[PDB]
Structures are given as C-alpha cells and as structure tokens.
Write a protein that binds this ligand. Structure first.
Ligand code: NO7
Ligand code: MG
Length: 379
C-alpha cells in the first residue's frame, strides 16, 4: 500500500527518508535542510517552536528550550542517567505522576514522548510534502542499548504524531543496511557513531543476513555540541583578554558565538583556517567587533580530550565482543561529527582500517530506516 517513511529520531538532529524506486530518498524540510534539530521550545507567550527556530533561541531562552530529551525517553526519574542529565542541562526535569522523568516549562509538563512527537510531527510534514498524501506507516530507529520501556516510549511518540510504527530497529543495524551489508555471508562490523549529543560504538556480526549486536558502548554526554561549547569557551576567553570585556553574562552575544563556533567547526572539516567575525558583538567606550582566525590545528587542540574520550569505549567494545582489530571487516561512520578529519584518523588508528565513508553519515540511519520500511511494504 502506502510507502513507509523511515525516521531517524536523533538526540540532536532528525532525518526522514523513503524508498523511491530502488534507492532511498532523504527528504528536505520547508527550510531546505535534510536534517531537523530535535529541539522544541515555548516562548514567553506560550507559542511552540520546533527545529531550527527553536535551536536559534536555545541560548537566550535556556529555561524553556528542550533538547536532547532522547536521554530521558522511557526512563524513570531516579535513573542515574536522568540525574546526570539534570546536572548537564538547564531546563527543568521533573518527576511525573508515575515516577517517570518528564520536562516542564512555564508550569506545563510534557513527557519525552510528547517532545519527541513534536519533532516527529515535523518529520511527518516534511514527508507528506514529498508524498502528496498522509503518511500512515513509520519505521523509527532507536539506539541498540534502548530497553523495552525506551522502545515503547519511542513507539508512543510515533503514535502521538499519527504514525503507526510498524517496527523499531537499532541505529547501527539501520546504518549497516544503508551500506548494503544485508547480504553479508560472514562479516564483523564496527559502527562508530558521533552525533551532536551522544557517542555510540557498536560491534555487529552479520551471518547469512542475520544481524547480531555483539557489544555496545559509548558516552551519552559526548557529542558535537560539546565540541561547539569548547570552542565557545576558548572564544570567550580570548575575547576577555584582547578587550577586557566578559561575554559570559550576555546570552544574546553567546547565542551568536555558539552559532559562530558551530559554523567555524564545520568549515575546518574542509579547510585549515577559518574566520570568526561577529561585528558589534558588545557595545562596551564603544563597540567591539570580534574577529579571530581559527586554524584546524588550534581547534584540534581545543577539542583534544573530547576526541580521545571515544577511544576507551571502543577498546572496551572490542574486548566485550571478544574481537580484535584484525577480525573487524569494516568500520562505518555515523553522525555529522565524524566529518572531522581528526575524528576519522582516530577511527583509523583504533580499528587499523580506513573507515567507510560511502554513505552520508548524517543520513545513513534514516536511509536504513527507509530500506527497512520498503521491505515491510513488500517492495
Ligand atoms: C565536511 C564537512 C563539514 N560538516 C560537519 N563538520 C562537523 N560537524 C558537523 C558537520 N555536519 C554536521 N555536523 C554536525 O555533527 C553534529 C550533529 O550530528 P548528528 O548525527 O546529526 O546529531 P544526533 O545524532 O545526535 O542527532 C553537530 O555537532 C554538527 O556540528
Ligand atoms: Mg548520530
């Protein structure tokens, strides 16, 4: 019947694709972007913002901007992960009536499934533009370590947006599907997944097309957003030095700096030097214009410990898989952050092999979701 959309409901960003003919097609939203920030915010008047609009005010509206709620979905408030999330995020996380971990803004409570549903709502609108009719059936990916309550709460997010979630599949298997590993006779796979919010490493074994997850590790609090924050703190400090003006108390300026830091980071994936240029950042004797040259080497030095924190979970995951570098047939990169050359060289060093880059790492999981969806559609 109707095509089945595949949605990567991501910690930081989300992506939707659908089978068109013999290949999956990634769909772009109304803003022209092929991914959508998994961000939901409520302004002082109570209007709701989703995606890029919410992201663009995250720093000036920290109390009422929900982000990385995938860290809460399907979790009890007393889960140590939730308590760790409370220490790391500024919006209010609260204990629901059933002891579940919920969020709160302006006196109103929301479950993480409701926040996810708002994101999925947007994913659905994006898909329906392309399809020309209502999207009924959905395949949504989840991390391999998600337990039953976390899978169920992701399905319920889908239902809230009107989607019949025909199946939930693990993100590293979805990515492997995007790479055609579905027909592998005997092959061990490493899936290195550095997203905007979280880091995952998974060791998969494929035998006659059967996927087994042999080990899982990572750091739920290591993502590209931390690379951006570390570049922000370095910018704030160099500014306080050259000008004597301290930006930390200036959320309007910090929002500009966070935007600049993420832009600069991404340019350095492709060139060795980039310019941070923020005219009239502060009007402190007169205006002060921020203008810094940032090199790849400097940025690599600023984020060194962040990249290195991916090494020990990977070695741990090979130990738990009773696998060695030699036994790993292929390493696949997932997440935007793996676009960074130093990250790719760190992956190379870990697994003794050039990682595969054949599939856009931002989009591989959504693509695999769509492939699974086409299978379910019989096509
Ligand atoms: C070549 C080149 C330049 N291209 C890039 N260079 C560095 N970073 C990039 C990036 N294009 C996206 N990014 C992102 O990586 C994180 C989100 O990735 P993500 O997988 O979608 O997040 P989630 O899975 O958690 O939802 C986020 O920091 C953002 O900079
Ligand atoms: Mg990712």
């Amino acid at each position: 019947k109707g095509a089945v959309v595949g949605i990567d409901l991501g910690t930081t960003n989300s992506c939707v694709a659908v089978m068109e003919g013999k290949q999956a097609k990634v769909l772009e939203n109304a803003e022209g972007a092929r991914t959508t920030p998994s961000v939901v915010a409520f302004t002082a008047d109570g209007e709701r913002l989703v995606g890029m609009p919410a992201k663009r005010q995250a720093v000036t509206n920290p109390n009422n901007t929900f982000y990385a709620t995938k860290r809460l979905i399907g979790r009890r408030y007393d889960d140590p992960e939730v308590q760790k999330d409370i220490k790391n995020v500024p919006f209010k996380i609260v204990r629901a009536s059933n002891g579940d971990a919920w969020v709160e803004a302006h006196g109103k409570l929301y479950s993480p499934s409701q926040i996810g549903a708002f994101v999925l709502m947007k994913m659905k609108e994006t898909a329906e533009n392309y399809l020309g009719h209502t999207a009924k059936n959905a395949v949504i990916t989840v991390p391999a370590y998600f337990n039953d309550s976390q899978r169920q709460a992701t399905k319920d997010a889908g239902q809230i947006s009107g989607l019949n979630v025909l199946r939930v599949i693990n993100e590293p298997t979805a990515a492997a599907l995007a790479y055609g590993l579905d027909k592998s006779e005997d092959k061990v796979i490493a899936v290195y997944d550095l997203g905007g919010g979280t880091f995952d490493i998974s060791i998969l074994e494929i035998q006659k097309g059967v996927f087994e997850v042999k080990s899982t590790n990572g750091d739920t609090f290591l993502g590209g957003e931390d690379f951006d924050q570390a570049l922000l703190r370095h910018i704030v400090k160099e500014f306080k030095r050259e000008t004597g003006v301290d930006l930390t108390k200036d959320n309007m300026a910090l929002q500009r700096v966070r935007e600049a830091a993420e832009k600069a980071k991404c340019e350095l994936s492709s060139s060795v030097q980039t310019d941070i240029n923020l005219p009239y950042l502060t009007m402190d004797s007169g205006p002060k214009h921020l203008n810094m040259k940032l090199t790849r080497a400097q940025f690599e030095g600023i984020v060194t410990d962040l990249i290195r924190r991916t090494i020990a979970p990977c070695q741990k995951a090979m130990q738990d898989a009773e696998v060695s570098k030699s036994d790993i047939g292929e390493v696949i990169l997932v997440g935007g952050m793996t676009r960074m050359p130093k990250v790719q060289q760190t992956v190379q060093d870990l697994f003794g092999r050039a990682p595969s880059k054949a599939v856009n790492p931002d989009e591989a999981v959504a693509i695999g979701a769509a492939i699974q969806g086409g299978v379910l559609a019989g096509d």
